[PDB]
Write a protein that binds this ligand. Sequence first.
Ligand SMILES: *[C@@H]1O[C@H](CO)[C@@H](O)[C@H](O)[C@H]1NC(C)=O
Ligand SMILES: *[C@@H]1O[C@H](CO)[C@@H](O)[C@H](O)[C@H]1NC(C)=O
Ligand SMILES: *[C@@H]1O[C@H](CO)[C@@H](O)[C@H](O)[C@H]1NC(C)=O
Ligand SMILES: *[C@@H]1O[C@H](CO)[C@@H](O)[C@H](O)[C@H]1NC(C)=O
Ligand SMILES: *[C@@H]1O[C@H](CO)[C@@H](O)[C@H](O)[C@H]1NC(C)=O
Ligand SMILES: *[C@@H]1O[C@H](CO)[C@@H](O)[C@H](O)[C@H]1NC(C)=O
Ligand SMILES: [Zn+2]
Ligand SMILES: [Zn+2]
Ligand SMILES: [Zn+2]
Ligand SMILES: [Zn+2]
Ligand SMILES: [Zn+2]
Ligand SMILES: [Zn+2]
Ligand SMILES: [Zn+2]
Ligand SMILES: [Zn+2]
Ligand SMILES: [Zn+2]
Ligand SMILES: [Zn+2]
Ligand SMILES: [Zn+2]
Ligand SMILES: [Zn+2]
Ligand SMILES: [Zn+2]
Ligand SMILES: [Zn+2]
Lengths: 301, 301
Amino acid sequence: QPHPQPPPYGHCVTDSGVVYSVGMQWLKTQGNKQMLCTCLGNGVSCQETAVTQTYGGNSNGEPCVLPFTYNGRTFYSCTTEGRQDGHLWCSTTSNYEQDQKYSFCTDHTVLVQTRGGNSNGALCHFPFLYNNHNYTDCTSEGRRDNMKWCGTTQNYDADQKFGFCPMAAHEEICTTNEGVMYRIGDQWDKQHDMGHMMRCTCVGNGRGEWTCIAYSQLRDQCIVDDITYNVNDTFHKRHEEGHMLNCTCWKCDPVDQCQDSETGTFYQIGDSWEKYVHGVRYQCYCYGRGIGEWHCQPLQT
Amino acid sequence: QPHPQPPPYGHCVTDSGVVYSVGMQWLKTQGNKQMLCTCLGNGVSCQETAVTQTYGGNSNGEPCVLPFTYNGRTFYSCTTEGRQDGHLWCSTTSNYEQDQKYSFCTDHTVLVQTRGGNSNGALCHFPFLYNNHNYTDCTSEGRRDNMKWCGTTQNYDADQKFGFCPMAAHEEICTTNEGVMYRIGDQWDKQHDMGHMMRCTCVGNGRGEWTCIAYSQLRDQCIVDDITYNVNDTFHKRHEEGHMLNCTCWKCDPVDQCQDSETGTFYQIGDSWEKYVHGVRYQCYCYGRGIGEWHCQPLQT
Ligand SMILES: *[C@@H]1O[C@H](CO)[C@@H](O)[C@H](O)[C@H]1NC(C)=O
Ligand SMILES: *[C@@H]1O[C@H](CO)[C@@H](O)[C@H](O)[C@H]1NC(C)=O
Ligand SMILES: *[C@@H]1O[C@H](CO)[C@@H](O)[C@H](O)[C@H]1NC(C)=O
Ligand SMILES: *[C@@H]1O[C@H](CO)[C@@H](O)[C@H](O)[C@H]1NC(C)=O
Ligand SMILES: *[C@@H]1O[C@H](CO)[C@@H](O)[C@H](O)[C@H]1NC(C)=O
Ligand SMILES: *[C@@H]1O[C@H](CO)[C@@H](O)[C@H](O)[C@H]1NC(C)=O
Ligand SMILES: [Zn+2]
Ligand SMILES: [Zn+2]
Ligand SMILES: [Zn+2]
Ligand SMILES: [Zn+2]
Ligand SMILES: [Zn+2]
Ligand SMILES: [Zn+2]
Ligand SMILES: [Zn+2]
Ligand SMILES: [Zn+2]
Ligand SMILES: [Zn+2]
Ligand SMILES: [Zn+2]
Ligand SMILES: [Zn+2]
Ligand SMILES: [Zn+2]
Ligand SMILES: [Zn+2]
Ligand SMILES: [Zn+2]
């Protein structure tokens, strides 16, 4: 394979045969595990994927470790999970339950892996210097076709190293507990309902999640219940989340108890329970949060 | 300007001189106003920007009108605003307060305006037919460089019309009430604090929003208050949102009242108020939602 044109002076020849220039960063991904690699003067340095441009939190605005674990799950991006305030947060270590350290995220708390260009899929380097101005995100500037690119080193004017910034990706398939594969936007009727039928949609939410909705009516009050799932794959474990809304018809009355959708049983806030559904043991919990919010995860060994 | 190679048979020569093929769609944007244009056999047809791949809501899963108005503001994407359940929703008409019709969004409730390629910035056409398979999102397939593209017509195998899908954009600047411009990630200390000092960050949230945080400690309890702002521009009006958290040290006790950050006054749920700050009249409201949530908008004429 040929080698880049200097500057920068110095190259890294990686295990796969790919040649990166000094100052470049790229992602080494093994199954679901991710490493952030750097081409230093003496060779390749790999470490925990750190994502910057954070603020607040108990960690003095330290960078994210992406992915991170929290509440038995893995998060590949910042989340609002666990928060009533809607703020996107991330763990500053790989294990949140252990270390308990976090920061809040901004529109720049992401790593952009480039395509095409000079850089062999290297990450964007921010800030990159172009026309004597520092760009902290991808630009259309200097291009007739208006395509969004970035420098893959600190100085593009000098190094001429770049790549194109693609649209962010998400999983395209929702796989049902019955093994049925659907695409984002597909609709079907729920396979295992509590007499009260449900309408399903493959929503995605970057994890191939599907949501099932059931509408109840007494002409005075309208009870709306929804359950969201995802099946396990290489990146994600199974998860289940149910809500219940009690609206006058709308005007919402808080729902402070949970109803498991596959049993029909009523649980109170702070209650845990187990269920065997479709040949798998689940552990459940009732949060409430005025929306009858309950979660389930498969029983772990 | 030259004309495309058929198929498709037939072309549209637009006001700007741009030539689109029959079956193509593009966005005509006038200031903050947006139109969705189609190249039909007889010419150009424009209408309200409709975004599909929705589900649920009181409208039978009708498409989004993007942008839409809700609660005195304009939304260019789906929002969770107003919802305690975190579900992304959109209005099915341009005015929500009037028509009250909505759908819920999926990972496909977006319109992707292409760059480069054959198509002059045309929107992605989903599904597009490639290698006798229908693609409902951008692909890496058929490309060595792994760049993400889409067909800009129903049949790419036949029409050969495509464009590249760029990374989604957001506003890069947070402009302060004092007129100070910051970039996403910049930090500063708040200009007008209630004795209790605040640390600011230019967060973005696709609207150049900046959040100010103040930490209070009694060693037993930790009160955390945050205020989020954006100044007016061509796309967005001014908005202000404050929260207050009361955590033991964490374990949260719900905060069911509001404290205006620029006055220090305590308001209860369902209370409205006015304030004159930095030479502008504001109308305010106390929602609570266990997080002392209050919003302000400038007084309208
Ligand atoms: C550009 O950024 C680098 C550090 O990111 C800084 O050292 C340099 O002073 C900046 N210069 C310009 C031209 O903005
Ligand atoms: C998915 O989960 C089932 C356990 O219910 C397990 O047997 C299977 O090996 C898992 N496979 C994948 C693709 O993770
Ligand atoms: C909804 O409200 C009615 C009274 O307002 C109450 O009886 C009912 O329990 C609430 N929800 C359910 C699950 O019935
Ligand atoms: C592809 O999609 C079009 C409608 O979107 C449909 O009419 C056609 O049958 C589909 N065919 C294939 C090959 O998937
Ligand atoms: C922004 O708001 C101020 C009113 O406070 C108004 O005078 C000014 O014209 C507005 N300008 C823009 C750029 O929208
Ligand atoms: C936080 O909790 C303490 C008692 O637990 C309460 O006195 C205090 O009012 C709460 N918040 C504030 C704003 O003081
Ligand atoms: Zn070399
Ligand atoms: Zn909010
Ligand atoms: Zn940006
Ligand atoms: Zn079954
Ligand atoms: Zn998955
Ligand atoms: Zn819900
Ligand atoms: Zn959960
Ligand atoms: Zn022609
Ligand atoms: Zn939730
Ligand atoms: Zn997709
Ligand atoms: Zn001032
Ligand atoms: Zn704006
Ligand atoms: Zn907050
Ligand atoms: Zn508001």
